[PDB]
């Protein structure tokens, strides 16, 4: 939507969009629309923009108002970066899915590694429905189906929030057991040994042992679940 501010000669001498079509102008939540088109890579690629040798196909929209279920370019499924050869023409298609109700301006966009964003034609998409009715869903290798809108968030909360609470409890325990002004004065008066000294170190070592045990137990427990995982592709 900000393509107006980009320099004119770079806009007209990098990518030449044509045959750009939007399958539907008005879409519902959980309804699929396809944005497709063809793009021509200018033969006289500017020196300012790096080579399109590393580039990514993207849908230019104000946030994830439309969830991208699949996108293709050059007759290839392209969830990762792709190479565009100078002077060639490529056909692309993005399968979008309505997520947020409203009127959104959705562009076709390709990003070059050393150049930045190149924004193609954009069309107003009207989305009707409610956000809470949105489900992706996706299927795992084992055959189970999950909803990416909500999957994994509960586990992340259940692992993160308790540890933040534990840290806050540790801070408040040491703050109430020894005051800030009180301990500062104590340390400044030479006696910075009755401010912290076993049984204080015993409490610290108990906390550390419990933390290590929880980390090991948590790591082992989350290895029983999801026993077969793969690195980021």
């Amino acid at each position: 939507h900000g393509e107006k501010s980009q320099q004119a000669f770079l806009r007209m001498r990098t990518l030449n969009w044509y045959d750009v079509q939007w399958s539907k102008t008005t879409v519902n939540v959980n309804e699929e629309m396809v944005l497709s088109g063809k793009v021509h890579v200018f033969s006289a690629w500017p020196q300012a923009v790096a080579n399109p040798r590393v580039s990514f196909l993207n849908a230019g929209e104000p946030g994830p108002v439309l969830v991208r279920t699949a996108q293709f370019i050059g007759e290839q499924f392209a969830p990762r970066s792709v190479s565009l050869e100078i002077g060639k023409d490529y056909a692309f298609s993005i399968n979008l899915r309505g997520r947020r109700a409203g009127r959104w301006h959705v562009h076709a966009q390709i990003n070059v590694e050393g150049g930045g964003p190149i924004i193609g034609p954009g069309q107003w998409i009207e989305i009707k429905g409610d956000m809470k009715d949105f489900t992706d869903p996706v299927t795992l290798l084992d055959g189970s189906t999950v909803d990416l809108e909500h999957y994994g968030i509960s586990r992340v909360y259940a692992w993160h929030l308790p540890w933040m609470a534990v840290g806050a409890a540790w801070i408040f325990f040491w703050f109430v057991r020894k005051g800030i002004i009180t301990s500062y004065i104590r340390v400044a008066e030479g006696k910075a040994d009755d401010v912290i000294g076993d049984d204080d170190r015993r409490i610290g070592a108990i906390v550390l042992a419990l933390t290590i045990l929880a980390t090991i137990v948590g790591y082992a427990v989350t290895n029983s679940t999801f026993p077969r995982t793969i690195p980021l592709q």
């Binding site: 939507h1 790096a50 104000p62 930045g116 002004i181 009180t182 500062y184 104590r186």
Partner: protein
């Protein structure tokens, strides 16, 4: 009379938090619906007006706060009584509490809110709604608060009046140096690096002056020195233990 007053601190905290909550609601409502395209006149109506109002208002506020604190200073700061000096130290701590809250709002909340806004738009201009809220409201606001905090100590407490506290200067200027890379990120985001990578060295000048927020350590230590010196021999040992 009353060493711990806290009415000023409560008023400042309430005002700042309510104002920032109002700003957050406003940008929730108008981030879309005339907050996306910077060339539409509705953007000028709803966002550029804020930008034009911000800078002169906060410049006037900071200059007036400094001038009022300078003209309201006592000329016999040395002859302050221990109880009045405790009251002034507590007021300074209230100032610094408001300062820390403002720093959290600006350097932490809106600064990383700009991160999520960068993934929503393609950066139509340098004056995005996030940039307007972050660069031109919150950073000047907390620098103004630091100026008030720095000048209160310079003009009410004899320890900070006899010279310039290096830690106080750092905590007043370095966080006021969290705005500079608006020139430098933008020039970096327009010349050096190509994508919206927050790891860019174009964001590293943001960091070197973000370390200056640690200058509050020395300020708090000096305040504690003043407090511990004021409480008598009975206060340090017999009472505080």
């Amino acid at each position: 009379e009353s060493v711990v007053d806290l009415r000023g601190m409560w008023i400042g905290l309430v005002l700042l938090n309510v104002f920032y909550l109002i700003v957050r609601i406003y940008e929730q409502v108008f981030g879309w619906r005339a907050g996306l395209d910077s060339f539409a006149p509705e953007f000028q109506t709803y966002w550029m007006s804020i930008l034009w109002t911000e800078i002169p208002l906060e410049l006037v506020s900071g200059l007036g706060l400094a001038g009022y604190l300078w003209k309201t200073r006592d000329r016999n700061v040395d002859a302050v009584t221990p109880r009045e000096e405790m009251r002034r130290l507590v007021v300074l701590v209230q100032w610094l509490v408001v300062y820390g809250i403002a720093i959290y709002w600006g350097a932490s909340f809106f600064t990383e809110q700009d991160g999520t806004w960068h993934m929503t738009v393609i950066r139509d201009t340098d004056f995005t709604p996030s940039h307007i809220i972050e660069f031109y409201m919150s950073y000047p606001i907390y620098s103004v608060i630091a100026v008030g905090a720095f000048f209160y100590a310079k003009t009410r407490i004899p320890y900070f009046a006899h010279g310039y506290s290096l830690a106080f200067l750092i905590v007043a200027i370095g966080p006021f140096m969290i705005i500079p890379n608006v020139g430098l990120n933008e020039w970096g985001h327009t010349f050096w690096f190509m994508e919206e990578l927050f790891v860019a060295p174009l964001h590293w000048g943001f960091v070197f002056f973000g370390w200056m927020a640690l200058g509050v350590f020395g300020v708090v230590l000096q305040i504690l020195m003043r407090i511990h010196a004021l409480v008598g021999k009975e206060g340090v040992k017999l009472l505080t233990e």
